[PDB]
Design a protein around this ligand. Structure first.
Ligand code: ZN
Ligand code: ZN
Lengths: 110, 106
């Protein structure tokens, strides 16, 4: 996690944070609305499976500096999110978790 | 295959269906284009970008090059445009993405 670019975040963003093993342990309400899912169907499940990426992408491929993935989060309700993955790291460099920031393509700024 | 693509909050974004017709466009893309939403939605992305002769949808998947476009008349804006595909679990395309980078962008 050398640059902060992939943790640039806005208040309308969906946030997912996982444990050491990539299982969702934090998910904010916006992420649940983007995903059309319930917190109970999310907590403890694998982030990459919930994001429908488990067969094209694995945790090992989340690098120190990642770019973004454009995802169709809800085809049933026309939502494109640019998705920024990143590792969480303690004081000596070791991965303790993972982050997904879900940016609505149509999100606004000032 | 998942395309990884560089994006910034200030970039214009255009999203299209399988036919390449614009369905989603953020406010920044409309500012860069200098065009109104209702003249953009449902029109061909490559027409709105004036590439219609020099680029084709079929080239997007396999292409890696980004292109330099002059975008706004009596505003004269230069953008770097990156093309990629939207692909779901199956592995089959649901549309296409245009990312518009202002060249003076930091
Ligand atoms: Zn955002
Ligand atoms: Zn940019």
């Amino acid at each position: 996690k050398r640059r902060l670019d992939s943790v640039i975040t806005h208040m309308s963003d969906g946030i997912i944070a996982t444990d050491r093993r990539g299982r969702i342990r934090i998910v904010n309400d916006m992420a649940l609305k983007m995903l059309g899912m319930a917190k109970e169907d999310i907590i403890g499940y694998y982030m990459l499976s919930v994001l429908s990426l488990e067969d094209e992408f694995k945790l090992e491929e989340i690098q120190e500096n990642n770019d973004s993935f454009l995802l169709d989060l809800n085809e049933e309700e026309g939502l494109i999110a640019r998705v920024n993955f990143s590792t969480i790291v303690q004081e000596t460099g070791f991965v303790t978790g993972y982050i997904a920031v879900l940016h609505d393509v149509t999100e606004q700024q000032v």
